[PDB]
Amino acid sequence: GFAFKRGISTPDLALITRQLATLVQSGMPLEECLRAVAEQSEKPRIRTMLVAVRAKVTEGYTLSDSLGDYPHVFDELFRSMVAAGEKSGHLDSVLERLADYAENRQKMRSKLQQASENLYPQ
Ligand SMILES: [Ca+2]
């Protein structure tokens, strides 16, 4: 009974984290923010995931706890940061920090991937 799951692409994580941060900072309810990010996704799997995260949130779970249903997508640091914002009343600010982080991660990582590819078939 071995299982294996992969997360999402670094740009896909950057997009959904930016969108969530944007919506939460505009003052819309968290559950409605999760709905909009899901409904705006081009990726069926991400829609399904965020529907599922939202479903746990509506059943009373914190965002951090709900994201822990997808540990292969949101790592311990990401979830820890969310948990910190929620425990402290600064989810809005932590999501902004997570969105900036994920964006810079995507950019840096994409560069390396591209440079690797560039040099290889040179
Ligand atoms: Ca920023």
Swiss-Prot record:
Keywords: Calcium, Cell inner membrane, Cell membrane, Membrane, Metal-binding, Protein transport, Transmembrane, Transmembrane helix, Transport. The keyword Ribonucleoprotein does not apply. The keyword Protein transport applies. Residues 1-115 are cytoplasmic. It comes from the Bacteria. GO terms for molecular function: metal ion binding. GO terms for biological process: protein secretion by the type II secretion system. It is found in: Cell inner membrane. GO terms for cellular component: plasma membrane; type II protein secretion system complex. Ca(2+) binds at residues 42, 96, 100. Type II secretion system is composed of four main components: the outer membrane complex, the inner membrane complex, the cytoplasmic secretion ATPase and the periplasm-spanning pseudopilus. Homodimer. Interacts with EpsE/GspE and EpsL/GspL components. Component of the type II secretion system inner membrane complex required for the energy-dependent secretion of extracellular factors such as proteases and toxins from the periplasm. Belongs to the GSP F family. This is Type II secretion system protein F. It comes from Vibrio cholerae serotype O1 (strain ATCC 39315 / El Tor Inaba N16961). The gene is epsF. The chain holds residues 56 to 170 of 406 of the full protein.
